[PDB]
Amino acid sequence: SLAEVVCLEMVDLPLTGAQAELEGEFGKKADGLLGMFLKRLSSQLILLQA
Amino acid sequence: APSLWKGLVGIGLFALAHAAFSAAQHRSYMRLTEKEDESLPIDIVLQTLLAFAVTCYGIVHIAGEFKDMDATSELKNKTFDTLRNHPSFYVFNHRGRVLFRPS
């Protein structure tokens, strides 16, 4: 049933786990300087653990 | 004192490198998401500028000689007593030689 093809298309993959984790970690709505510094420190600690 | 300045310069360089790594991670995340043409956050930009100014201060203090233009002040404390003797002509005929002969 794959001989006669009428229409065709291509789509991409959703995401990658580490890439999605980084994207979620960067997401900030409204925060102060201290909050961003703490988030940066947490990300650095996670990177060191990895 | 110079050791403190060297340590401060090293710490500033390390902070600059850490800010560079943070900016690299920010750009790596930016490449993930479509559009969203935003700049890097201002906190890291201020930190890297602080590291830029801190290392710029000790780099001037490490190499400071600033010797005097006038050469008369460098032959000022020197006396004629030391200048009278010369390394070239040296006679080894003195009373101290026979005084120090036996010990």
Side-chain angles (χ1 to χ4, degrees):
Chain A
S1 150
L2 205 51
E4 334 164 67
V5 182
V6 201
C7 85
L8 170 141
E9 210 182 337
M10 282 158 136
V11 199
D12 303 348
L13 294 323
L15 270 193
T16 318
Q19 263 174 320
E21 264 156 33
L22 286 186
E23 180 166 9
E25 283 178 0
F26 188 89
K28 150 264 168 174
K29 284 183 183 180
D31 270 324
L33 306 180
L34 296 178
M36 291 315 78
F37 196 60
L38 290 178
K39 283 192 174 152
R40 250 73 152 181
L41 293 180
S42 298
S43 297
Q44 186 179 358
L45 293 176
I46 293 167
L47 290 176
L48 290 178
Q49 294 174 335
Chain B
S3 178
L4 179 64
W5 307 129
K6 292 179 182 178
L8 180 65
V9 168
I11 293 166
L13 177 62
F14 177 78
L16 177 72
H18 176 243
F21 195 11
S22 173
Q25 221 85 65
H26 172 295
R27 196 41 166 69
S28 175
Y29 151 86
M30 168 65 169
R31 192 155 259 131
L32 199 42
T33 286
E34 297 176 350
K35 296 179 179 179
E36 294 304 316
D37 284 345
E38 211 207 280
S39 292
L40 60 166
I42 299 171
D43 174 77
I44 281 297
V45 169
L46 286 157
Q47 176 181 359
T48 192
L49 278 169
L50 285 174
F52 157 85
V54 162
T55 308
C56 201
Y57 164 70
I59 207 55
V60 194
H61 273 217
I62 287 312
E65 325 175 319
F66 282 142
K67 296 195 336 313
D68 260 297
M69 227 160 301
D70 307 297
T72 166
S73 47
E74 98 191 0
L75 327 181
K76 162 247 283 181
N77 67 73
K78 164 182 281 213
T79 181
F80 163 79
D81 180 272
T82 85
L83 174 131
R84 138 188 60 109
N85 74 264
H86 332 107
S88 268
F89 305 88
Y90 253 120
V91 80
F92 289 100
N93 291 123
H94 29 283
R95 41 222 157 88
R97 179 158 163 80
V98 306
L99 194 166
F100 295 144
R101 154 200 51 71
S103 186

